[PDB]
Design a protein around this ligand. Structure first.
Ligand SMILES: Clc1ccc2c(c1)N(CCC1CCNCC1)c1ccccc1O2
Length: 273
């Protein structure tokens, strides 16, 4: 019934997340994304309300797909003999933030502010649903170009959020915090804040601040592009070497650089249309 219920279009991409295709739900004409993962490539398993064996990714997605948010929602899923297939929302027209930044270079602060704020609201939403993403980065953010709305993707490296230490990680090394690099240990929220500092630098500079392990550990931030003092300060705070010196989400969102955020639609009219 996956074959009759969905019409398959082109391959959008493939990678550690599997293979994702453009698609249409035949019932209405809802644009969707169809994501295939081989069972043998799934190390992380969990269990449902009734309790079948599913990828952890499905558990995490169900927990965050209830109601609206800045997260791409799981609409349905299917099990095949050797794979799982996930049906996800697909905005149209859409561009990922990595491609967007590659094309336009460094973002104006007004645009970075609106984008970053929406990322924060989306991550707070995950954390409130009990989910830690663990791979927040430009390539895992989609822009709905008409509404100016940002949407999180790829919970395949994620976990249930907890207050105790994580000693495993399968996200992106150059967004991973120094405590992971040095000790193979981190706590959820403070690691997420570090990766948010990396993302914000990426937005306002057009590239990531650290390539090598030693630079991450050193934690000295050099600005290659002109960036306001208030924005440099927020970035340097998120990228504090000691986890406990980093801001909470509330402190990030009350920071002076974060005031007077544009609405998504305004953001699209000014910067995206
Ligand atoms: Cl339109 C669309 C909707 C929903 C999507 C996805 C796309 N993707 C693909 C992301 C692009 C990034 C640029 N390079 C190619 C893959 C996705 C990738 C991994 C997990 C879930 C995903 O859920």
């Amino acid at each position: 019934p996956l074959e009759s219920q969905y019409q398959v279009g082109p391959l959008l991409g493939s990678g550690g997340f599997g293979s994702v295709y453009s698609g249409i739900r035949v019932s209405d004409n809802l644009p969707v994304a169809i994501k295939h993962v081989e069972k043998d490539r799934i190390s992380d398993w969990g269990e449902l309300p009734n309790g079948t064996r599913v990828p952890m990714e499905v558990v995490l997605l169900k927990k965050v797909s209830s109601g609206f948010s800045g997260v791409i929602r799981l609409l349905d899923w299917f099990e095949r003999p050797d794979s799982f297939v996930l049906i996800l929302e697909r905005p149209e027209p859409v561009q990922d933030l990595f491609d967007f930044i590659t094309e336009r270079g460094a973002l104006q602060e007004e645009l970075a502010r609106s984008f970053f704020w929406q990322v924060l609201e989306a991550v707070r939403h995950c954390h409130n649903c009990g989910v830690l993403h663990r791979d927040i980065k430009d390539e895992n953010i989609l822009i709905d170009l008409n509404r100016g709305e940002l949407k999180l993707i790829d919970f395949g490296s994620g976990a249930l959020l907890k207050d105790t230490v994580y000693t495993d990680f399968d996200g992106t090394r150059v967004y991973s915090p120094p405590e992971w690099i040095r000790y193979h240990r981190y706590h959820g929220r403070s690691a997420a804040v570090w990766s948010l500092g990396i993302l914000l630098y990426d937005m306002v500079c057009g590239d990531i601040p650290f390539e090598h392990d030693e630079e991450i550990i050193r934690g000295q931030v050099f600005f290659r592009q002109r960036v306001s003092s208030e924005c440099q300060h927020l970035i340097r705070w998120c990228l504090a070497l000691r986890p406990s010196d980093r801001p909470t989400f509330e402190e990030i969102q009350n920071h002076p650089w974060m005031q007077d955020v544009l609405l998504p639609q305004e953001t699209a009219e000014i910067h995206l249309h």
